[PDB]
Amino acid sequence: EEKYTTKYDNVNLDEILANDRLLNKYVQCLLEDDESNCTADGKELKSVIPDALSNECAKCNEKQKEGTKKVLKHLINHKPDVWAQLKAKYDPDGTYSKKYEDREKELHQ
Numbered sequence: 147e148e149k150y151t152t153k154y155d156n157v158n159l160d161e162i163l164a165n166d167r168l169l170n171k172y173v174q175c176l177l178e179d180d181e182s183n184c185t186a187d188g189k190e191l192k193s194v195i196p197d198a199l200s201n202e203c204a205k206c207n208e209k210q211k212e213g214t215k216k217v218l219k220h221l222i223n224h225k226p227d228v229w230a231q232l233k234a235k236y237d238p239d240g241t242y243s244k245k246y247e248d249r250e251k252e253l254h255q
Contacts, residue, residue, distance in 0.1 A: 149207035154187060159213050162191075163220040170228075173221075177231045191217070196236050199243070219246060226252040 152159050162168050174183035175192050184192070194210045195218070197203050203211045222229045230252070233243035 149209070152187075152209050152213065157187070159209075159217065163217055163224070166224060169221070169225060173225065173228050173232070176235060177228055195232075199236065219249070222247055223250055226250055 157168075162172065171183055172185055172188035172191060175181055175185075175188055191210075191214065194203060194206060195214050197205065198214050198218070203214065221232070229247075233240070233247065237243035
């Protein structure tokens with residue numbers, strides 16, 4: 147499959163992390179008991195997020211390789227309560243999500 151730059155009707159990744167109103171819809175895609183919420187770019191973004199853990203995004207284009215890696219850090223800092231739902235489904239042993247969760251470690255002792 148071919149790949150292209152991250153633009154759709156004046157939206158980019160820089161607005162996704164900066165605009166939690168967008169971000170909350172993109173996370174609902176795997177946080178809720180339904181998946182009707184998964185946006186046109188959101189469904190692709192969330193589908194490569196676990197590939198950054200399965201194969202370090204080695205199959206990806208450079209925009210995804212940098213993109214999900216930067217977005218991960220913002221999401222754990224700005225959506226800590228919803229991030230705990232991502233890493234629980236995506237890393238049920240905490241073997242690799244803990245590597246950068248430690249920057250905030252929102253799970254109080």
